[PDB]
Design a binder for this molecule. Structure first.
Ligand SMILES: [K+]
Ligand SMILES: [K+]
Ligand SMILES: [Mg+2]
Ligand SMILES: [Mg+2]
Ligand SMILES: [Mg+2]
Ligand SMILES: [Mg+2]
Ligand SMILES: [Mg+2]
Ligand SMILES: [Mg+2]
Ligand SMILES: [Mg+2]
Ligand SMILES: [Mg+2]
Ligand SMILES: [Mg+2]
Ligand SMILES: [Mg+2]
Ligand SMILES: [Mg+2]
Ligand SMILES: [Mg+2]
Ligand SMILES: [Mg+2]
Ligand SMILES: [Mg+2]
Ligand SMILES: [Mg+2]
Ligand SMILES: [Mg+2]
Ligand SMILES: [Mg+2]
Ligand SMILES: [Mg+2]
Ligand SMILES: [Mg+2]
Ligand SMILES: [Mg+2]
Ligand SMILES: [Mg+2]
Ligand SMILES: [Mg+2]
Ligand SMILES: [Mg+2]
Ligand SMILES: [Mg+2]
Ligand SMILES: [Mg+2]
Ligand SMILES: [Mg+2]
Ligand SMILES: [Mg+2]
Ligand SMILES: [Mg+2]
Ligand SMILES: [Zn+2]
Lengths: 101, 47, 142, 116, 154, 53, 110
RNA sequence: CGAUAGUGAACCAGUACCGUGAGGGAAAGGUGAAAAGCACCCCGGAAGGGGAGUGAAACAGUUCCUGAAACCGUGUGCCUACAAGUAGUUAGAGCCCGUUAAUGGGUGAUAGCGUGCCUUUUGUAGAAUGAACCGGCGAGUUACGAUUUGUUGCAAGGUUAAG
RNA sequence: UACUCGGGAGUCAGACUGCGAGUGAUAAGAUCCGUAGUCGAAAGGGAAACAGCCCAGACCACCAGUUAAGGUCCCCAAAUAU
RNA sequence: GGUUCGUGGUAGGAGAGCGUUCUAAGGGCGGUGAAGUCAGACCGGAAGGACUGGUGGAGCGCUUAGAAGUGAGAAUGCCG
């Protein structure tokens, strides 16, 4: 069985035991996260959302809050002496899926 | 003496012109391009 | 994150036969190009040849509407001064139609190492018979 | 007091040059070329982070369409039927299903084909 | 500068026709053994704030020592002869054990000598008491006569 | 008549593929089992075609 | 196990030596000695003395069989240049680079 | 100031060198605490090496503390002889490693996109200029005065200059 | 938002496009004014490529979505559409 | 800490800072190995800063203030 769940302004395909990374969620390590914006379910079945499956959810466990690898942004405009430099580390939350309800 | 903290707004870091483009005081160093005023000693009398 | 990228050999690749009788050069070529690039398959991956192998027969009966038999002119140049040689599409349909469909489809494939590799998957015959029965190929309808 | 320009110049330039790693010849060795290769790579990466999203949407669409032609719909009528039906699953998921769960892709295509 | 460095004068090559960059002296700044462009020149940095501000400064640093409980006021301070042993022993009989400034006006015949070998210790004749010389130290060891003199001054 | 560009390390080396020199066409004397040039007199034994010189 | 020799600051130019070395590298010492004897180049006696020294000190220090030795690695590093001028026409001179080498041979059984 | 600095000159420098001459005018510092400066052996005509030994150390051996980069090479893990491409980037297999362990490293078949930097220009990939490269040095400063902002102290008062 | 006072500037080579007039030949990527826009100082999508046209204004990331100009047989995303 | 509007930019204005040399004071590491240099897959919104290891083999950081010969990629730049 698998599902499709909306998270962080986007949709991800999800199975149990799968280790997932998403945008930052308010939630500490070990805590539990309920995704109620399930779009689709598959596996020995098929129930289609219009847009969301009524009453279906997904449960997951926060394994880490983190900031990803250091990205360097740099823009320049030639012969105009404009340079600009910026760092970024997009904060993420790591999840482990428990089950699909 | 290891704690000296003079008054605020009494002291202020010298502008240092011509040490980069990110300073905004770089290449031309506040003089613009190519005139009598962009030159060393450039300018005219006061009147 | 995670979306499928094919691999060379990851995909079955089939052998198709087309009767080119009466169909217009361009329409047939447009269908063949897409077959070779692999856009009829959802295993498509732009940097990999997922496409199929293709055979064309009765190419000397390929359709040419209008006065293209006399007025559509193919050109070659030898890179020598005045080394320009012209030939008509109808004349080519008569004598060397294989080169005709080759020319049509080459301009409709991508202009890369891959597209050159894809051109090799095309086997053209002005007749009704081909050499590739060992591959036991299937008919494709446009 | 005097300030010899010691050690900061070469620290900075080494840092740039090591960021110029993997490049042809003098680009991974020499600062005057490496600096501008590094800048150009940064700029290319900036705009490729935008072009990448376009490219993937393009591929997603292509695969969806290749999969819906088998079911005798086009991408266009498929998307239309899906909006009418009201499900907002996206191109990425549709491609994943088209390439791995073709049965479920076809289920959704049938639902669209009904809503039309 | 390029006028003080030894040499120059010759233009090293023609303005035109050599292919070299136009130059005017072998001692110009861009040249190896050449002049410095502005650089240092001898200067007095000394400035003095107004007298009232300075008086306030001394009054304030002294009261800071008071609030921090780092004054030590003593009836007198004399030595029969210069003896850094005895001076140091006094500096334990009052638990100073830090950097300190002794202030004196009395007889005080041998105290400067008996202190001058010690590094963290300074001594002055009660007119010389500076903001800087105070702040440069931790504790302030002022005799009765010295404080009376500082009072009548301030 | 003057270089417009400096030859790179790679292009330099790609010319220098062929500047090499060959192992000499030598072999061992039948008399002294010691290397010598074919059709030449051995400098060690001073002998050729079975005949001292 | 290995044994090497080095001829530092030899006047031969490095290219002119390397052009010869490229034959020697990876061969049995009898063969290589013969290559150098019968290869008519300025560098060959130099490289021959370096090779023979490597063999000698293999024998005498490390106690090895000469008759199983190969050339493990040979090379030519640059050395100091002696800087010189030919006098050239119209008053001006042009540089000359009397170059030198550090020729290095290393020897080992199989 | 700390050896492109600081006197031109930290060293046998107003020398060498240039010039008929007046005159111009450099470069060039560092073994080690101590020469204890490699007895003796081997290759070699010598130079130079390899051992041995001295020494804390000789990858400190008579430009000898450290020893960057350009530069020259040796070897090798991955790719490359149907392919043009400001040389990368993004997608990305396969192969190879295993890290300041983190949604890791190196390579990159192939696919997409993509005409350097600076200067001056209405406008430059620019067939306009400058730079071979690397390294070092190299351009708004100081004195005195004017004006304005901010701060501090005193306030219809404030402040001293020389001495 | 405007105005006033004060400190500090840089600018005084402008370019095309559309509209209105001149000179011109009712020519010029000409020239000179007025007007509005873009470039200058603006990346991005479309005009094959393209400063100056059409759409439209980039803080950063995202393997999310809807749209503009322009387009939907292939190169090349989307209709071999009614 | 919130709500609203914003966050392309040349000349140019305004602000906040990174870093280098030196000084004073405080407080420190450093032959059980300093500066420096070499390599790294760490850190910070940037200039930049740590950690580990090798080489080196005697000095150097940190903190708060202050002062400047203060940061180079171009000058047909100067020397090597
Ligand atoms: K510098
Ligand atoms: K170190
Ligand atoms: Mg400032
Ligand atoms: Mg300013
Ligand atoms: Mg500016
Ligand atoms: Mg500049
Ligand atoms: Mg200028
Ligand atoms: Mg002008
Ligand atoms: Mg001006
Ligand atoms: Mg989009
Ligand atoms: Mg003079
Ligand atoms: Mg002559
Ligand atoms: Mg030095
Ligand atoms: Mg000097
Ligand atoms: Mg040395
Ligand atoms: Mg090939
Ligand atoms: Mg050119
Ligand atoms: Mg040039
Ligand atoms: Mg340079
Ligand atoms: Mg015009
Ligand atoms: Mg107009
Ligand atoms: Mg301009
Ligand atoms: Mg634009
Ligand atoms: Mg375009
Ligand atoms: Mg431009
Ligand atoms: Mg904006
Ligand atoms: Mg849409
Ligand atoms: Mg298409
Ligand atoms: Mg801005
Ligand atoms: Mg400077
Ligand atoms: Zn013989």
């Amino acid at each position: 069985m698998y599902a499709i769940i909306e998270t962080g302004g986007k949709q991800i395909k999800v199975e149990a035991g799968q280790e997932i990374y998403v945008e930052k969620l308010a939630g500490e390590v070990g805590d539990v996260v309920t995704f109620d914006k399930v779009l689709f379910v598959g596996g020995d079945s098929a129930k289609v959302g219009v847009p969301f499956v009524e009453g279906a959810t997904v449960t997951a466990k926060v394994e880490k809050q983190g900031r990803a690898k250091k990205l360097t942004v740099y823009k320049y405009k030639p012969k105009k002496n404009y340079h600009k430099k910026q760092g970024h580390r997009q904060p993420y939350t790591k999840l482990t899926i428990d089950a699909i309800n | 003496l290891h704690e000296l903290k003079p008054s605020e707004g009494s002291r202020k870091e010298r502008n240092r012109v011509g040490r980069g483009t990110g300073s905004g005081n770089g290449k031309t160093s506040g003089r613009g391009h190519k005139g009598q005023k962009a030159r060393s000693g450039g300018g005219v009398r006061l009147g | 994150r995670t979306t499928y990228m094919a691999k060379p050999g990851e995909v079955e690749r089939k052998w198709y036969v087309i009767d080119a009788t009466g169909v217009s050069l361009g329409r047939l070529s447009s269908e063949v190009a897409s077959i070779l690039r692999g856009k009829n398959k959802p295993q498509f991956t732009p940097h990999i040849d997922t496409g199929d192998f293709v055979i064309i027969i009765n190419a000397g009966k390929i359709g040419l509407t209008g006065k293209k038999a006399t007025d559509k002119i193919y050109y070659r140049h030898s890179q020598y001064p005045g080394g320009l040689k012209s030939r008509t599409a109808g004349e080519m349909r008569t004598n060397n139609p294989e080169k005709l469909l080759e020319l049509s489809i080459k301009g409709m494939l991508p202009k890369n190492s891959l597209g050159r590799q894809l051109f090799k998957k095309l086997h053209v015959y002005g007749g009704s018979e081909h050499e590739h029965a060992a591959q036991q190929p299937e008919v494709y309808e446009l | 007091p005097r300030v010899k320009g010691g050690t900061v110049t070469r620290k900075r330039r080494k840092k740039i040059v090591k960021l110029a790693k993997g490049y042809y010849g003098s680009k991974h060795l020499l600062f005057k070329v490496a600096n501008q290769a590094v800048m150009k790579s940064y700029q290319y990466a900036y705009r490729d982070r935008r072009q990448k999203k376009r490219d993937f949407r393009r591929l997603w669409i292509a695969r969806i369409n290749a999969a819906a032609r088998m079911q005798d719909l086009s991408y266009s009528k498929l998307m239309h039927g899906l909006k009418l039906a009201g499900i907002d699953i996206n191109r990425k998921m549709l491609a994943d299903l088209a390439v791995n769960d073709i049965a479920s892709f076809n289920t959704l295509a049938d639902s669209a084909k009904k809503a039309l | 500068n390029r006028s003080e460095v030894r040499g120059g004068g010759r233009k090293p090559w023609r303005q035109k026709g050599t292919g070299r960059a136009r130059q005017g002296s072998i001692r110009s700044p861009q040249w190896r053994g050449g002049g410095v462009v502005f650089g240092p020149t001898p200067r007095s940095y000394a400035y003095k704030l107004p007298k009232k501000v300075r008086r306030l400064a001394i009054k304030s640093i002294l009261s800071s020592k008071v609030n921090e409980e780092k004054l030590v006021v003593l009836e007198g301070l004399t030595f029969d002869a210069p003896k850094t042993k005895e001076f140091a022993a006094f500096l334990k009989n009052i638990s100073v054990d830090t950097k300190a400034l002794i202030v004196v006006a009395g007889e005080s015949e041998n105290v400067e000598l008996s202190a001058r070998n010690l590094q963290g210790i300074t001594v002055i004749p009660a007119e010389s008491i500076s903001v800087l010389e105070v702040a440069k130290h931790d504790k302030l060891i002022i005799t009765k006569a010295a404080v009376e003199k500082v009072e009548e001054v301030l | 008549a003057v270089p417009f560009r400096r030859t790179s390390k790679a292009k330099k080396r790609k010319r220098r593929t062929h500047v090499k020199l060959q192992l000499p066409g030598m072999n061992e004397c039948s008399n002294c089992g010691e290397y010598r040039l074919s059709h030449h007199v051995c400098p060690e034994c001073g002998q050729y075609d079975g005949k001292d010189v | 196990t290995s044994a090497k020799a080095v001829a530092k600051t030899v006047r031969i130019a490095p290219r002119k030596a390397r052009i010869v070395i490229d034959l020697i590298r990876g061969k049995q010492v009898g063969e290589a000695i013969a290559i150098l004897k019968y290869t008519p180049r300025s560098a060959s006696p130099i490289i021959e003395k370096v090779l023979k020294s490597a063999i000698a000190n293999a024998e005498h220090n490390y106690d090895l069989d000469i008759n199983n030795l190969v050339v493990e690695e040979a090379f030519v590093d640059e050395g100091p240049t002696l800087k010189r001028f030919r006098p050239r026409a119209q008053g001006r001179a042009s540089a000359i680079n009397k170059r030198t080498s550090h020729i290095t041979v290393v020897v080992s059984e199989v």
